[PDB]
């Protein structure tokens, strides 16, 4: 069994910054991580990893 | 994504909040003044014994200003001492004019900055102000920069 | 020697305590501190040390 992980950065100024409409930058950056995790799981299933056996 | 500046600008204190390291498990032999380079003369039980820089030594860090540990005004013999091993710090100097930015500093006797043409070591960080008919400079200390001669 | 706090003492101004854990990426750091002074002999001549036994 293996473990997976990543991280993201955000600043208080960009938290302050507002947009006319659309999902907030923090929410988009948080959804990107989940999408990356799912894509990596799919890639591990369908392509493998030689160094990790 | 930026680094904040630190306001009081006195000798012996830190000038920025960038990555720094403070080695607080040390003791002093002799007397040391805030803002001077120190050297490691020995190790006892995980404690480093430091003294003021002589001729021929390799500097290890710079004494750091604290308002609880040192009630006298300087560091006294047999006292626990704070030493900065990595970061930007204000140092006493005997120079007259500011050296070139990012040059290599050279330490005279007593742990004062007197040269700006060294081969390797600590570097000038761009700060140069005046203290007491003398000046203060800003040095960037790195951990493995000066290596003890075999 | 004569056991009486008026002659010798060992004092503990602060007992052992654990500071709150500082989190980092995927681990924690838990520091601890305490204070002590050692042995202070206010009234000497009440202690006899026989050496070379």
């Amino acid at each position: 069994v293996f473990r997976l992980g990543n991280a993201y950065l955000i600043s208080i100024d960009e938290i302050k910054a507002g947009q006319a409409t659309g999902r907030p930058l923090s929410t988009r950056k948080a959804s990107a991580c989940q999408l990356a995790h799912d894509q990596l799981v799919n890639r591990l299933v369908f392509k493998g990893s030689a160094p990790h056996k | 994504y930026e680094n904040l500046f630190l306001r009081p600008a006195c000798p012996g204190n830190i000038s920025d909040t960038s990555t720094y390291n403070i080695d607080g498990a040390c003791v002093a032999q002799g007397d040391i003044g805030f803002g001077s380079a120190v050297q490691v003369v020995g190790i006892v039980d995980g404690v480093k014994v430091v003294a003021a820089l002589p001729d021929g030594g390799t500097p290890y860090g710079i004494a750091f200003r604290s308002q609880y540990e040192h009630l006298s005004g300087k560091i006294l013999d047999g006292e626990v001492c704070n030493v900065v091993s990595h970061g930007r710090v204000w140092t006493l100097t005997s120079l007259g004019e500011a050296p070139s930015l990012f040059s290599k500093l050279q330490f005279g006797s007593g742990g004062v900055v007197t040269g700006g043409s060294g081969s390797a070591g600590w570097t000038f960080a761009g700060g140069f102000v005046k203290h007491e008919d003398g000046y203060i400079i800003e040095v960037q200390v790195k951990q493995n920069a000066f290596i003890a001669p075999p | 020697y004569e056991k009486n706090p008026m002659n010798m003492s060992i004092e503990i101004p602060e007992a052992f305590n654990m500071l709150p854990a500082q989190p980092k990426d995927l681990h924690f750091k838990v520091p601890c501190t305490s204070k002590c002074t050692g042995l202070t002999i206010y009234r000497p001549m009440t202690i006899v040390l026989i050496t070379g036994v």
Partner: protein, 156 residues
């Protein structure tokens, strides 16, 4: 018929155990390749994946360049030969900066602030042939028949 009391001291170091909470940096995105490594030994990097990003590491050999030292971990290490090692095809915790206790083969205390030299098998030695840029941090102790030294590392 008088009472008695006894006093005993713990040991102060272990192989691969982190010396203190000063500046340190840990690489956890590596994978061991072609064998197993010892907790408290230097390792070398073969290649770095361009897209995947995982580094491939193995035990230090002759003519190579050190990159870091594997550290202790009660969860990622496997127990063999009465010691913790990292078996092949698993994530490894390399240390790239900081103070750490390393296995040594020397017989005399070193000089504080001097450069470190290693053996061909990743164990420090006072007169090794591999030259590094790490330094001695002053520590020098001994566990039960095991010799440990405190070494300070900076980023390559």
């Amino acid at each position: 018929q008088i009472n008695a009391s006894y006093q005993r001291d713990m040991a102060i170091a272990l192989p691969g155990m982190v010396a203190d909470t000063s500046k340190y940096n840990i690489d956890g995105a590596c994978v061991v390749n072609e064998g197993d490594v010892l907790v408290g030994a230097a390792v070398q990097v073969v290649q770095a994946q361009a897209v995947d990003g995982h580094k491939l590491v193995k035990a230090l050999t002759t003519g190579t360049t050190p990159y870091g030292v594997a550290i202790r971990s009660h969860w990622q290490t496997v127990n063999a030969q009465n010691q913790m090692i990292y078996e092949d095809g698993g994530a490894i915790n390399v240390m790239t900066s900081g103070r750490v206790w390393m296995l040594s083969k020397s017989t005399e205390a070193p000089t504080f602030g001097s450069a470190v030299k290693l053996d061909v098998d990743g164990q420090e030695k006072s007169d090794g042939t591999i030259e590094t840029t790490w330094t001695y941090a002053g520590g020098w102790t001994k566990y039960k028949d095991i010799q440990l030294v405190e070494v300070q590392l900076h980023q390559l």
